[PDB]
Amino acid sequence: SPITGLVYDQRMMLHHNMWDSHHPELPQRISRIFSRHEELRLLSRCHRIPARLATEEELALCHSSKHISIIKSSEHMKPRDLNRLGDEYNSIFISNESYTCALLAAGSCFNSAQAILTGQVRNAVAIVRPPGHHAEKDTACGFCFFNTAALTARYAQSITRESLRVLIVDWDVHHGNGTQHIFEEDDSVLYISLHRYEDGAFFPNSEDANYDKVGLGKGRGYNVNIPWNGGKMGDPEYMAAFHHLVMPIAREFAPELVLVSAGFDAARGDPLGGFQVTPEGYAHLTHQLMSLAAGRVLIILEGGYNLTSISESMSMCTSMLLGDSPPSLLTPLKTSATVSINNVLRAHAPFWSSLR
Ligand SMILES: NNC(=O)c1ccc(Cn2nnc(-c3ccccn3)n2)nc1
Ligand SMILES: [K+]
Ligand SMILES: [K+]
Ligand SMILES: [Zn+2]
Numbered sequence: 001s002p003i004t005g006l007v008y009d010q011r012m013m014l015h016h017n018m019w020d021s022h023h024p025e026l027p028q029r030i031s032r033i034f035s036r037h038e039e040l041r042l043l044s045r046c047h048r049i050p051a052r053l054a055t056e057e058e059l060a061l062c063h064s065s066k067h068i069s070i071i072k073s074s075e076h077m078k079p080r081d082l083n084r085l086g087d088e089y090n091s092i093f094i095s096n097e098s099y100t101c102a103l104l105a106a107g108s109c110f111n112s113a114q115a116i117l118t119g120q121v122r123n124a125v126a127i128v129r130p131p132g133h134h135a136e137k138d139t140a141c142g143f144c145f146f147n148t149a150a151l152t153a154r155y156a157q158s159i160t161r162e163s164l165r166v167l168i169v170d171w172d173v174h175h176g177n178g179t180q181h182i183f184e185e186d187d188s189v190l191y192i193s194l195h196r197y198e199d200g201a202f203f204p205n206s207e208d209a210n211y212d213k214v215g216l217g218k219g220r221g222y223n224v225n226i227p228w229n230g231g232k233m234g235d236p237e238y239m240a241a242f243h244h245l246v247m248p249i250a251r252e253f254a255p256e257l258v259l260v261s262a263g264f265d266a267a268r269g270d271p272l273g274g275f276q277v278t279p280e281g282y283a284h285l286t287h288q289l290m291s292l293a294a295g296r297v298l299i300i301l302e303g304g305y306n307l308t309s310i311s312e313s314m315s316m317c318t319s320m321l322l323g324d325s326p327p328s329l330l331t332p333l334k335t336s337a338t339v340s341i342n343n344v345l346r347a348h349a350p351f352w353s354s355l356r
Contacts, residue, residue: 172263
């Protein structure tokens with residue numbers, strides 16, 4: 001009821017890079033975040049939600065039978081065939097434990113969404129790996145095998161109603177290409193992504209991440225890309241994007257469930273992101289999202305590679321979900337961030353009355 005759920009399972013650490021033990025998507029990303037929850041005495045304040053495996057029928061909510069079979073077959077592959085398989089995708093490493101870990105990341109979030117929708121908890125945090133937002137219906141991409149957040153939105157609809165309004169806010173520094181594509185023609189799942197773009201120089205290097213990709217057919221206006229260019233964005237820019245775009249659109253949509261594709265790679269210290277969002281910044285973003293869907297928010301870990309930065313930033317999010325007071329939070333925005341916000345406003349004003 002006025003309770004916060006938490007899911008963490010050390011078995012998700014088994015997925016590893018056998019060729020490059022220093023690859024940034026480390027097993028210790030989740031163990032360090034979990035340890036930070038214990039240090040801050042946040043863990044004991046949460047209701048512990050068990051991890052479970054997603055079933056193949058559950059993966060079929062978003063992914064093709066071919067994709068599921070190929071990833072599933074990797075459990076039995078010798079190192080040379082895992083190397084060959086991983087090479088078929090853009091930025092993927094596979095071990096014999098990868099498939100099981102991807103299943104545990106998905107099942108953990110389904111048990112979390114279930115705990116929220118059955119009223120066992122009000123909100124929840126899922127300390128999971130490998131991430132999921134780059135995974136497409138038919139392919140793995142950018143360290144992602146199955147689209148955990150997209151699958152969770154479909155799972156939530158499968159236990160309530162097909163038309164359950166789900167908002168996905170993706171604040172990982174990378175565009176969730178897989179999430180956008182899965183729901184592109186869908187008006188029941190509003191996808192809002194903030195991401196470093198650099199006119200396509202930043203991963204995943206596609207114009208699909210630009211502000212003018214507003215969705216297709218009945219999904220027109222239900223895909224909101226907030227792309228950053230020419231600038232090391234931080235709290236002022238993220239707070240402004242939430243003030244002018246994320247919160248007015250989300251309030252008009254009136255979601256019944258909020259999923260956060262919460263990568264912490266836009267954080268200060270992240271070696272891949274190059275951005276400066278502070279743990280207090282993430283706490284303010286989380287607190288804002290809690291005003292939606294009667295507080296039904298599920299925070300799902302995506303990217304984020306500086307171990308101290310992700311541990312502090314995610315723990316700060318859990319603290320906000322537990323009802324703790326938002327911490328003290330800057331400056332005028334980078335000129336290109338105003339350009340980006342204004343481009344999104346022009347793109348989405350025809351679909352949202354709150355922007356007009
Ligand atoms: N949420 N998505 C992501 O977090 C995401 C996905 C894909 C990439 C591409 N990439 N960048 N650096 C690398 C890299 C660095 C060191 C060793 C091997 N690889 N790989 N970046 C980030
Ligand atoms: K994003
Ligand atoms: K959509
Ligand atoms: Zn990322």
